[PDB]
Write a protein that binds this ligand. Structure first.
Ligand code: CUZ
Ligand code: CUA
Ligand SMILES: [Ca+2]
Ligand SMILES: [Cl-]
Ligand SMILES: [Cl-]
Ligand SMILES: [Cl-]
Ligand SMILES: [K+]
Ligand code: NA
Ligand code: NA
Ligand SMILES: [Zn+2]
Ligand SMILES: [Zn+2]
Lengths: 581, 571
């Protein structure tokens, strides 16, 4: 299998990397592991203007006031258990958001702050019949209401919730109150069931408290039951949020209709659906095991056909110290990170099931040393029924001596591993910034990108509407609209000239500059920077972009095209020559 | 004779060089390993970095000063300080064209430690360092002509007081040293190997303006200068007046809208790339004393070569073996040529100085050979940074990566060996040998980077190395804590809604690589605390109720559980 991509050759896979606490999404070529693009999401990007432009701030909403995010879990939308290449979704643990990225333009196009929760961590997508819901865990228990009356996590109204977002509308669909908390989550291959690990069944705030119980659990959600209660109006609402809220807590040992709690040791972490749809596999973390939940036994479990929730466990292989996450080659093998032993362990799932029945059989096939302390791992197409068994990325948290020293802060080590054969082969050490936690690969032919914008693209349609109100045809017009102390500049751009090369305003005016790149050649992006005003943005071919700033300094102020004589001048008349307020 | 260096750095092997890439319009500096071309680290400078909290923390905002209000930068030209014409590994400097700044990066901690807004100018673009006897000055071009004063009375760019200026910054103090008014616009700049001369390409035939830095220093020492506005910076007038020269400058006619301005590693030439002219112009540095002394009949007499090379020459670099390498933007090539043969051709000899043209993909701007800015230029690696990558990488939407192409120059024939895609047009880069960079493994508790925070802690009676304390001061709350995986030293505290909370964390772990983080959920608060570092961040607790904070940097098996609670009592 070819590991090295030479000049003129192209990568075989796209890789979509979480940006970690840096807040972006990164597009890599696989197997070269080179970074092809950065997609700003929760970060403010000087280069494109994301977080500065009106289009981007409109998408972020009120959360545009935050300059940070913390992402972990990128996932690609699916149709019938296969990637359809439409959307990528990712979490923000820092400011409790989910974002949607459109894979045709490689931009974030939608963002939501999840109501009545703190810290969106675990995230994964419904697989079947398609990605109708984005499933997202809120990790931290909080009071409801959280108004400063009650701080006690043991209060009956202190809890966290499982969250379902409508993937197409990026509005909330429902939330389910759970016992304990929520770590990671995955969905089955039918649409009925989703599942999440919990590490804080104790509802504690201290370290020893969260570690007390020998078993926490994975909570299983009957999504069909949830939907039926919503359609029946059997729900409540919290605060000013209209989101339907269902109670999936146990009441005095009696289960709700919406959830079952399968005891799993111990502070379990990863929650991974095998690519054949047979299992939710929970990684034991503090227990040296994974627990294999038989999805085929879940209907009987919710129908009371089983005596003990543990009856849905059909395997619990002992694997090594600190199992965190599991992935799949599509050949029947699972691959699990061992954080403490610092390895990836390859094991056969059907043999583990047989060992759980007492059959003496060695289900462990290989242990590969990684460098060092691996967290997530990802095999190519592992989240689909097309899991191809070719590439594996293990994302390790301490790179130590594997790269040149660069000061007290080290890179992460994302190691590419060839799993096409019976023996795992470490082929490449990939240093990355700010701790990507996890990544997702797609075949080259699963992603179809636009090379030039459509003039009706929803990304800037609000700006087109604003322009229409000013009587502006954006494809042609080079005009300065004045409106009190507001100035709206509209111009076309075509290399190497701005359509408006100078304009004059009064000191203190609020200036909006809207630029429509009317070029039609690929790769010829333009930029716009106003010197010493903190203004910067990208305008690609046929895109309209706009940015608003206060002309707070009198005098002449240059603007220039960043993304390459293509310059202009803003002239600001001093306040003392104009009416005084 | 052959170019046959190994390019593969396999698992467990280390790169041979550091590469320092400009972050382009994204505003950071990036550390790469060469020849693997992998990005080892991002150093935030003019960008706001969610990961480390640069732009959010009190330490970073103190370094940025008032310019902390800007969330953008536009970087181009990274350079490493020198002693006796060789890299000394102390500092890296870089420009900000967008908000007119220069930043200094300390190469032992790989952080920006100083930043200056250059007064009375717009857009710092070209930038290079004094070489000899060391980098006493950072030389920086302000690109755009503006009125002086720029107070809104005069907008006329032809006015006698409309001009731009060449800027000298004291590398060690990061304060302005002096500014020189010039005729025309400044493009790129470089310095000689004595400390006496610097040069910059100019567009108003245009010119290369040469600065006699010794003459400038003498005028400053004598008090023969003016100041502009409210800046104390000495300002000298390097313009021609009624055709008569300043003592500070000479204008050497050079075709045509010349762009790159590069000092050859043997110290013989300032080489200006011709752009609109399919040539480079070679200025003999050893004729400059005669030029300034009035012993030459014509400023053109310092030109000793003008080789014809191809369409669109933009920048030049050196292998230390006598060859120059120049980017041809239109022809989309690197052309390797012999400088002494070009000089003889200029005198009329029949000699072909062109050695090879290598196709690059596509439209190269800057290029950089390893150690090319030093008298130790080693002729091993070349990076050409091309603007239009077209079909050289997988498609990724309407925006495309820059193509930074690694070229083996160790032998007679240039060999293209790697295409490296990069984000936001890095534009230019610089390389250093592995052994020229020495980095700290853990922070020093006396480090100036957070010394102002240590001072604040001292005013509160706090021993940062041990204390876990909450200081109440009106509506201000100052939390001080130690951190040691997997526990914050203060795991809960209570404030009043509206309070201004400062959280100062000292990571007292001693193990390399065990960094800690701090994030306050739904408050826009995030920062890094590496081993032995103190970091602080200020935010207002504007929301009543229980608000979680957690460690963002995976540091331990129990990392998910390294958390705390801020309790905010309602108004
Ligand atoms: Cu957020 S956790 Cu194992 Cu996913 Cu990294
Ligand atoms: Cu300390 Cu994560
Ligand atoms: Ca527990
Ligand atoms: Cl998981
Ligand atoms: Cl140059
Ligand atoms: Cl040679
Ligand atoms: K790390
Ligand atoms: Na929204
Ligand atoms: Na400063
Ligand atoms: Zn440049
Ligand atoms: Zn250039």
């Amino acid at each position: 299998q070819k590991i090295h991509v030479g000049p003129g050759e192209l990568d075989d896979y796209y890789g979509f990397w979480s940006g970690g606490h840096q807040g972006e999404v990164r597009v890599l070529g696989v197997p070269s592991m080179r970074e092809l693009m950065r997609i700003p999401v929760f970060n403010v990007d000087s280069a494109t203007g994301w977080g500065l432009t009106n289009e981007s701030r409109h998408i972020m909403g009120d959360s545009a006031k935050f300059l940070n995010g913390d992402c972990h879990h990128p996932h690609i939308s699916m149709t019938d258990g296969k990637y359809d290449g439409k959307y990528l979704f990712i979490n923000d643990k820092a400011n409790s958001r989910v974002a949607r990225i459109r894979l045709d333009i490689m931009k974030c196009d939608k963002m939501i702050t999840v109501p009545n929760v703190q810290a969106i961590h675990g995230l994964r997508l419904q697989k079947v019949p398609h990605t109708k819901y984005v499933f997202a865990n809120a990790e931290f228990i909080i009071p409801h209401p959280n108004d400063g009356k009650v701080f006690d996590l043991q209060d009956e109204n202190s809890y966290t919730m499982y969250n379902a977002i409508d993937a197409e509308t990026m509005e909330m669909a429902f939330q389910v109150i759970v016992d304990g908390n929520l770590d990671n989550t995955d969905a089955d291959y039918t649409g009925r069931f989703a599942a999440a690990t919990c590490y804080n069944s104790e509802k504690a705030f201290d370290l020893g408290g969260m570690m007390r119980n020998e078993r926490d659990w994975v909570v299983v959600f009957d999504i069909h039951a949830v939907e039926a209660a919503v359609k029946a109006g059997d729900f409540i609402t919290l605060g000013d949020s209209k989101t339907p809220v269902l109670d999936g807590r146990k009441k005095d040992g009696k289960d709700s209709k919406f959830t079952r709690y399968v005891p799993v040791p111990k502070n379990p972490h990863g929650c991974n659906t095998s690519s054949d749809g047979k299992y939710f596999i929970a990684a034991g973390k503090l227990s040296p095991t994974c627990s294999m939940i038989a999805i085929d036994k879940l209907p009987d479990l919710f129908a009371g056909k089983l005596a003990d929730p543990r009856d849905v466990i059909v395997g619990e292989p002992e694997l090594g110290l600190g199992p965190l996450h599991t992935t799949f080659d599509g050949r029947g093998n699972a691959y699990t990170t061992l954080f403490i032993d610092s390895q990836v362990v390859k094991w056969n799932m059907e043999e583990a099931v047989r060992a759980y029945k007492g059959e003496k059989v060695n289900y462990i096939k290989q242990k590969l040393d990684v460098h060092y302390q691996p967290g997530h791992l990802h095999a190519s197409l592992c989240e689909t029924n097309e899991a191809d068994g070719k590439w594996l990325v293990a994302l390790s948290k301490f790179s130590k001596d594997r790269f040149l020293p660069v000061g007290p802060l080290h890179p992460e080590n994302d190691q590419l591993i060839d799993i096409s054969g019976d023996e795992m082969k470490l082929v490449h050490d990939g240093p990355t910034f700010a701790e990507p936690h996890d990544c997702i690969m797609a075949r080259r032919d699963q992603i179809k990108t636009k090379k030039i914008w459509d003039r009706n693209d929803p990304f800037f349609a609000p700006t087109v509407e604003m322009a229409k109100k000013d009587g502006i045809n954006l494809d042609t017009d080079n005009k300065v609209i004045r409106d009190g102390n507001k100035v709206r500049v509209y111009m076309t751009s075509m290399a190497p000239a701005f359509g408006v090369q100078e304009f004059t305003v009064k000191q203190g005016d609020e200036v909006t500059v809207t630029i429509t790149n009317i070029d039609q050649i690929e790769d010829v992006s333009a930029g716009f920077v106003v010197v010493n005003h903190g203004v910067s943005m990208e305008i690609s071919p046929q895109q309209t972009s706009s940015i608003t700033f206060v002309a707070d300094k009198p005098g002449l102020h240059w603007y220039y095209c960043s993304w390459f004589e293509m310059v202009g001048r803003m002239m600001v008349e001093p306040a003392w020559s104009h009416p005084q307020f």
